Design a protein around this ligand. Structure first.
Ligand SMILES: OC[C@H]1O[C@H](O[C@H]2[C@H](O)[C@@H](O)[C@@H](O)O[C@@H]2CO)[C@H](O)[C@@H](O)[C@@H]1O
Ligand SMILES: [Mg+2]
Ligand SMILES: [Mg+2]
Length: 484
């Protein structure tokens, strides 16, 4: 990570061009260049690159992923003065609190709404159950009732939760991480309704974000389900749209998981004070939020002064009505595993590859498998932590003409280093020095036990994959694997 610069990652559906304008302003006032990027699969790429000490200075995502990042030591604890904290709503700070510590800046509150074409559908349905017959009628005029992103469980969750689906049971001030709530009658009823929509040819299992967006914005489908960020592209389209409450299911509201768009600081960033000043004094201002919101709407913003104006928008009022019917997502480390499990179940049921019963029955197991991989990847990141220390040791004693000591050709104890999950030591000969990290035979993931990561050290300190590595390739940072 470059010192004296700011690299920002934010998802491609957000107002990153508007964010870059706030960036350019910061660059004018400070001389600090700000670069805004939007990598695909950003929320999965960041933990990998941050593990090797690289990545963005600042990462934006909904708050649900941040407990996982914090747990893996990837986030800097944030430190705003109480005067600043008073500028944002209290419940938004709560969303970014993990283990007592604030782990990000809250930016905006997002919930899914029902978006409808007022010309096709002046009076949109209040119930999911009306939608099949509505589609049949619209098909006669060459239109469809509803299209939305079926590939991400975020979009199907409001229906799954309506009759009783839940992520983790909340009992006695804690989440029960072993009580996952998609293997119950309520979840099954919601997913069954969805699968029948596909079986009855009212929806296609392959519909994704782009397909649904293009169909709604071109007037081919009467309704879609999406968040505030989507409104901008509809604004530029011919469509006259309305934003309203999600349909009910079995007389109960759809319950979208509510996300707080948040900005965290990379633990490995050399630019932490700069990141803080950008976020506190440029982004989280009326002018800063407006710049982004003008690009792609944020929803209901955490900043009280600017949300004062936004709240008069009927679209934000619907956003907040849906948010209240739903629930704020947990931020616990198991959230990404939960999301992997629900994505898999929904897709397996959608495609017809598994029954709704079988798909949902496998979810907790699938979540566990995902979480075990997450733990192993986190533990493996220690090798790059230890190697970074050892790599400076390597360059300081290369002066003695060797990879070690003040001249030895065996590793001194000053060339070894102990870790929590394994030990690293310098190796090699001549100017081609290596670092080897060996996992313990127990007390670490059984995916990792007794395996080793072997790194070649360039003269410039860049670590590449040596073929002696037998730590599983899929648990290593992809950039490291690529160098192999
Ligand atoms: O689909 C699972 C996914 O849901 C949420 O992601 C949302 C995100 O919150 C929104 O800002 C927007 O980008 O759409 C995403 C879904 O495509 C969770 O935040 C995420 O962790 C989870 O994987
Ligand atoms: Mg008209
Ligand atoms: Mg059936």
């Amino acid at each position: 990570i470059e010192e004296g610069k700011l690299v920002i990652w934010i998802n491609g559906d957000k107002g990153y061009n508007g964010l870059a304008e706030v960036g350019k302003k910061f660059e004018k006032d400070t001389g600090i260049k700000v670069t805004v990027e939007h990598p695909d699969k950003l929320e999965e790429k960041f933990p990998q690159v941050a593990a090797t000490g690289d990545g963005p200075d600042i990462i934006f995502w909904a708050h649900d992923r941040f407990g996982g990042y914090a747990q893996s030591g990837l986030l800097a604890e944030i430190t705003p003065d109480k005067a600043f904290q008073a500028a944002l709503y209290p419940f938004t700070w709560d969303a970014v609190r993990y283990n007592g510590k604030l782990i990000a800046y809250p930016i905006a509150v997002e919930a899914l709404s029902l978006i409808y074409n007022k010309d096709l559908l002046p009076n949109p349905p209040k119930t999911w159950e009306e939608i099949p017959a509505l589609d049949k009628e619209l098909k006669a005029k060459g239109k469809s009732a509803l299209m939305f992103n079926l590939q991400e469980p975020y979009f199907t969750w409001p229906l799954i939760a309506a009759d009783g689906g839940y992520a983790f049971k909340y009992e006695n001030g804690k989440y029960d991480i072993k009580d996952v709530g998609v293997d119950n009658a309520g979840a099954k009823a919601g997913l069954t309704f969805l699968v029948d929509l596909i079986k009855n040819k009212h929806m296609n299992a392959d519909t994704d974000y782009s397909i649904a967006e293009a169909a709604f914005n071109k007037g081919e489908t009467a309704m879609t389900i999406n968040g505030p960020w989507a409104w901008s592209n509809i604004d530029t389209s011919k469509v006259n749209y309305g934003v309203t409450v999600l349909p009910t299911f079995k007389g109960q509201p759809s319950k979208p998981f509510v996300g707080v768009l948040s900005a965290g600081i990379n633990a490995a960033s050399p630019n932490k004070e700069l990141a803080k000043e950008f976020l506190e004094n440029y982004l989280l201002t009326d002018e800063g939020l407006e710049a982004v919101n003008k690009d792609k709407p944020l929803g209901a913003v955490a900043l009280k002064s600017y949300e004062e104006e936004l709240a008069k928008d009927p679209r934000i009022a619907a956003t907040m009505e849906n948010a209240q019917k739903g629930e704020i997502m947990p931020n616990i480390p198991q959230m990404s595993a939960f999301w992997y499990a629900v994505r898999t179940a929904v897709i397996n049921a959608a495609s017809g590859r598994q029954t709704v019963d079988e798909a949902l029955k496998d979810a907790q197991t699938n979540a566990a498998a995902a979480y075990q991989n997450y733990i192993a990847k986190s533990q493996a990141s220690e090798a790059f932590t230890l190697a970074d220390g050892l790599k400076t040791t390597i360059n300081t004693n290369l002066q003695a003409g060797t990879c070690f000591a003040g001249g030895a050709t065996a590793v001194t104890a000053a060339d070894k280093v102990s870790g929590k999950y394994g030990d690293a030591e310098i190796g090699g000969t001549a100017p081609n020095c290596t670092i080897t990290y060996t996992f313990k035979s127990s007390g670490v993931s059984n995916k990792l036990t007794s395996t080793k990561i072997v790194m070649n050290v360039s003269e410039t300190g860049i670590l590449t994959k040596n073929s002696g590595t037998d730590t599983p390739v899929e648990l290593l940072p992809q950039s490291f694997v690529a160098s192999g």
